[PDB]
Amino acid sequence: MGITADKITSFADWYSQVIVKSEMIEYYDISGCYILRPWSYFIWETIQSVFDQKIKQHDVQNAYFPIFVTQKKLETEFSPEVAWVTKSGKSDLAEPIAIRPTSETIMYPYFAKWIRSHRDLPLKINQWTSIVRWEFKHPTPFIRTREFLWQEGHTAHSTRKEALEMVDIILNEYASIYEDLLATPVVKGTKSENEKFPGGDITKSIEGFIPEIGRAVQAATSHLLGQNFSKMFGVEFEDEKGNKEYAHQTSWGLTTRAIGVMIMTHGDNKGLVLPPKVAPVQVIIIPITEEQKKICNEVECILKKAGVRVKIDDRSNYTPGWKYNHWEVKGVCLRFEVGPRDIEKRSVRVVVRDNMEKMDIPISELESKIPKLLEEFQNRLLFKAKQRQNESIIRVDTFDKVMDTLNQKKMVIAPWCEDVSCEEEIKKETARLSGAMKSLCIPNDQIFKIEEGKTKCFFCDKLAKKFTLFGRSY
Amino acid sequence: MGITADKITSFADWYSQVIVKSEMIEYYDISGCYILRPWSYFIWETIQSVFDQKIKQHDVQNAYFPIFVTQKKLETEFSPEVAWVTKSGKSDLAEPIAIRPTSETIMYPYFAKWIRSHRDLPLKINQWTSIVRWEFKHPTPFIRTREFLWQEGHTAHSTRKEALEMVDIILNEYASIYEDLLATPVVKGTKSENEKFPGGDITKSIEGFIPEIGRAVQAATSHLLGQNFSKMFGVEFEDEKGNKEYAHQTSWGLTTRAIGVMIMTHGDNKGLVLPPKVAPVQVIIIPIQKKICNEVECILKKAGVRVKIDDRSNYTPGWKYNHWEVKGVCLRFEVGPRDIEKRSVRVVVRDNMEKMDIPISELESKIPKLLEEFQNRLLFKAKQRQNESIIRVDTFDKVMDTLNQKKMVIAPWCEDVSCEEEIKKETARLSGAMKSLCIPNDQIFKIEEGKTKCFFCDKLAKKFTLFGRSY
Ligand SMILES: Nc1ncnc2c1ncn2[C@@H]1O[C@H](COP(=O)(O)OP(=O)(O)NP(=O)(O)O)[C@@H](O)[C@H]1O
Ligand SMILES: Nc1ncnc2c1ncn2[C@@H]1O[C@H](COP(=O)(O)OP(=O)(O)NP(=O)(O)O)[C@@H](O)[C@H]1O
Ligand SMILES: O=C(C[C@H]1NCCC[C@@H]1O)Cn1cnc2cc(Br)c(Cl)cc2c1=O
Ligand SMILES: O=C(C[C@H]1NCCC[C@@H]1O)Cn1cnc2cc(Br)c(Cl)cc2c1=O
Ligand SMILES: [Zn+2]
Ligand SMILES: [Zn+2]
């Protein structure tokens, strides 16, 4: 089978067939829960190892804290989306316990106990875990699940300056995970006061955007918590002159959401298209079997010494047409066809997945040439998704064009006053008129200028502080 | 602070002090749940990566299935020990859902759907996860916890031969994790009918033993499930001539218990002793000059060795010596003026207290080599202690005396279920219970075919079996 829904006009059906026929996902009989079959789980394992290697270079250490937390401890800080354990076997528990929705209330009482002097700082912890949250919005594979996988990092420092720089380091690593690994463009910025994590001072984030349906997605985040939680839990150290001070904290997380943004970004009407740095198989060799079976395996050896993941499909019970569609659906980058005249010429017929480009390549040039085609594919995918991200951002300086452009499926960049009240009104109005539009982020990179004391909010009557990105959110 | 309990006369207090002062573990306020701080989590990560690479050579693929299961699906195949979610926020759920205690009932309905033809076999799946089980027995860190981490492997094959080959391959990799990585001796064998996993036909395992308290522990396990589960869930394939048959299944798992067994095996009255293949830090460099410390260091990183300097002014050399000893660092380098003058390092070796002077010029070559020697020494001594703890008995008479010397018993046995049941009752009354641990693969001792009798029952013995008190 092939894909029978169109990406642009039947997106939901398209996304569903693509993740099921590729064997990325299976649907389960508890709503919002999804099985990650090997084909998608390989992508998560790759993300794990690249990010892990990065944080190790800034001395983050891995640990594992428990999945349960008591209500006493959870209700020190959100509650209707928490799952509670009340029973073991048939008999009621004397008091209920919560499955972990995040680890602050599990971890921080122990930070208080371990930290006594500036010499115990910095303290940098990370754990890879699963998380449960009882979502009220409708679920969607990867993007919004009841159980998801993530890492959560939690640091403590002696100055604000050192904590803020760790916030920024992590935010850059996250951007690199999306751009360099997943070939998915993202926009770095700061969250408005209405949209930030309420238990912290600042929240930075990366935003991405699915152009076929007009919706922004928050792709990862990184908080300067400051002294908010350190006062709340008693996290304090003796400085050099004997004086107790409250530590300056950060936290940050990234989830399997990443995998879904990537699929929705690169996929087409024939199936998955995958970045070669995360594709479980990059090259599949299909012979049209006598001296064929010797040339196939020579080609395999060559690619394997070179570091390329390659398989041969030499099954007798399938048409070459069937095979072509099977590996296309699974997003294999390169497809080598090997028949009689390919043997006769000592060369391989190549078809490139994302563009349908055909090429013949002598065998003695494979060692050099294939690694280099894979680097080109990786760069072409990021370059195209970025151009489409740019086509989707429209500058507006007043309210009158907004609704026209949200209905073309776009994001808005607009000068803005950043007040909470202003944001709440924008929301009410856009909803009424359509569905609501919210602030996504204030981009770190301001490609457009504020004339000092002349430029107005695009909505309120006040003066603008900066330009800000707005749109409808997944 | 150092260790103020004796391993032999105060084992419980000893084990607790060692894992807390080492900074491996922190106690938490829900019983049976323990935090794994980086010093112990590093050892789990190492286990993960070594086992992962091995199973990949036999084509096992990793996946991740959900944590929840419906009571409908769970009660197709152990009731009082499962944890139930009944509420989100303040509102009751329509129906309760179980946190995963094992994954058969989560995985196998999907195996039934994916498997149609012999061309879809073998199917080989592994997942790394956490598990919850509401234990009734008293908890102990690593050994028996409410939440634990593990891998669970689940396979399906078109013949029993191939499924059994896979059971044995896994059992050998588990033996190798304990022996080659953790320097901890284990005994391979087959579980008795009374002790095997009821859902399957055969269960193999490795058993460890802690000589200081006289108790066996089951270290990992591996089942030939045969066709029992395939019939229960409908896992069938068509052969080459169109005939439907039920697939032949295996499963196997290993948990964070491994870390506990290793700790209890090698640790002494000064603290952790760690196999160098899993020590988070292998060499600590302590100065009593700084160009010379950083030189030794560089030499050791190019060589592939995990090394740190402790150059803190506010602590005495004797405080540092204890600190890194408690934490089980293999090799301690002392660098004073005397040492600096001679272009040599004073070395102190953690398990034997042995002292050496090594020239800086010889470090590239000689430190790896010490670390291999230390790794082998640890396994060698634990093996000798395992042998002293195993006594041949041919009748019931010396059994109790032998259990009360903190030992295991190897004995001729008939292998009946009713025989084992009675052995349990009697040894309990008389002390608590002894049960069968395994029937070793390796049968040192010989059966007189026709003449040799059960040591307890009056029937004929099938072969020699290992019995003892279990953790
Ligand atoms: N249900 C979910 N499924 C998958 N990923 C999620 C889910 N909820 C949040 N995420 C991701 O987790 C990252 C950080 O989590 P967190 O900041 O706690 O989320 P949040 O505040 O609830 N934001 P959001 O869930 O997007 O409204 C987010 O930036 C999302 O990319
Ligand atoms: N509570 C626990 N905590 C940690 N590890 C455990 C626990 N229970 C079992 N294990 C380990 O998990 C492995 C797989 O065990 P499993 O198939 O569940 O058998 P079991 O009958 O539950 N074992 P046991 O707890 O010794 O009676 C065993 O070989 C044990 O080493
Ligand atoms: O989860 C967070 C804040 C941060 N925690 C560390 C990892 C990165 C993450 O952004 C915000 N958050 C999000 N969702 C939640 C859902 C529930 Br239910 C609860 Cl109780 C609490 C929360 C809650 O605190
Ligand atoms: O967990 C098992 C059998 C195997 N499952 C796959 C990994 C290896 C493991 O040995 C046996 N077992 C053990 N403990 C259990 C506890 C509960 Br509670 C339940 Cl419901 C079920 C079980 C249960 O089935
Ligand atoms: Zn305004
Ligand atoms: Zn008998």
PDB file of C-alpha atoms and ligand atoms in Angstrom, chain B residues 133 135 142-145 148 150 218-221 223 253 255 257, ligand 2:
ATOM      1  CA  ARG B 133       5.529  -3.767  41.719  1.00  0.00           C
ATOM      2  CA  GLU B 135       6.312  -5.713  47.117  1.00  0.00           C
ATOM      3  CA  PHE B 142      19.064  -2.404  44.479  1.00  0.00           C
ATOM      4  CA  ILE B 143      18.065  -5.892  45.487  1.00  0.00           C
ATOM      5  CA  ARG B 144      14.295  -5.523  46.023  1.00  0.00           C
ATOM      6  CA  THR B 145      12.802  -2.068  45.289  1.00  0.00           C
ATOM      7  CA  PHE B 148      13.223  -0.624  39.495  1.00  0.00           C
ATOM      8  CA  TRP B 150      15.405  -3.068  33.643  1.00  0.00           C
ATOM      9  CA  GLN B 218      18.490 -14.779  41.548  1.00  0.00           C
ATOM     10  CA  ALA B 219      20.604 -12.555  39.205  1.00  0.00           C
ATOM     11  CA  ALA B 220      18.784 -12.629  35.881  1.00  0.00           C
ATOM     12  CA  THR B 221      16.514 -15.023  34.015  1.00  0.00           C
ATOM     13  CA  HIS B 223      12.419 -18.351  29.545  1.00  0.00           C
ATOM     14  CA  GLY B 253      15.155  -9.615  31.786  1.00  0.00           C
ATOM     15  CA  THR B 255      17.525  -5.315  36.557  1.00  0.00           C
ATOM     16  CA  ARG B 257      19.705  -5.657  41.305  1.00  0.00           C
TER      17      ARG B 257
HETATM   18  N1  LIG C   2      11.630  -6.117  43.486  1.00  0.00           N
HETATM   19  C1  LIG C   2      12.669  -6.279  42.673  1.00  0.00           C
HETATM   20  N2  LIG C   2      13.625  -5.335  42.643  1.00  0.00           N
HETATM   21  C2  LIG C   2      14.669  -5.492  41.829  1.00  0.00           C
HETATM   22  N3  LIG C   2      14.902  -6.513  41.001  1.00  0.00           N
HETATM   23  C3  LIG C   2      13.948  -7.461  41.027  1.00  0.00           C
HETATM   24  C4  LIG C   2      12.814  -7.406  41.835  1.00  0.00           C
HETATM   25  N4  LIG C   2      12.017  -8.527  41.641  1.00  0.00           N
HETATM   26  C5  LIG C   2      12.687  -9.224  40.727  1.00  0.00           C
HETATM   27  N5  LIG C   2      13.855  -8.632  40.322  1.00  0.00           N
HETATM   28  C6  LIG C   2      14.828  -9.155  39.317  1.00  0.00           C
HETATM   29  O1  LIG C   2      14.098  -9.236  38.065  1.00  0.00           O
HETATM   30  C7  LIG C   2      14.589 -10.363  37.338  1.00  0.00           C
HETATM   31  C8  LIG C   2      13.397 -10.875  36.448  1.00  0.00           C
HETATM   32  O2  LIG C   2      12.451 -11.312  37.410  1.00  0.00           O
HETATM   33  P1  LIG C   2      10.989 -11.833  37.209  1.00  0.00           P
HETATM   34  O3  LIG C   2      10.887 -12.499  35.892  1.00  0.00           O
HETATM   35  O4  LIG C   2      10.036 -10.757  37.560  1.00  0.00           O
HETATM   36  O5  LIG C   2      10.985 -12.947  38.370  1.00  0.00           O
HETATM   37  P2  LIG C   2      10.527 -12.878  39.909  1.00  0.00           P
HETATM   38  O6  LIG C   2       9.819 -14.099  40.124  1.00  0.00           O
HETATM   39  O7  LIG C   2       9.597 -11.664  39.976  1.00  0.00           O
HETATM   40  N6  LIG C   2      11.995 -12.716  40.854  1.00  0.00           N
HETATM   41  P3  LIG C   2      12.186 -12.588  42.626  1.00  0.00           P
HETATM   42  O8  LIG C   2      11.800 -11.155  43.103  1.00  0.00           O
HETATM   43  O9  LIG C   2      13.572 -12.908  42.953  1.00  0.00           O
HETATM   44  O10 LIG C   2      11.191 -13.550  43.343  1.00  0.00           O
HETATM   45  C9  LIG C   2      14.979 -11.371  38.425  1.00  0.00           C
HETATM   46  O11 LIG C   2      15.999 -12.258  37.929  1.00  0.00           O
HETATM   47  C10 LIG C   2      15.443 -10.553  39.623  1.00  0.00           C
HETATM   48  O12 LIG C   2      16.875 -10.427  39.680  1.00  0.00           O
END
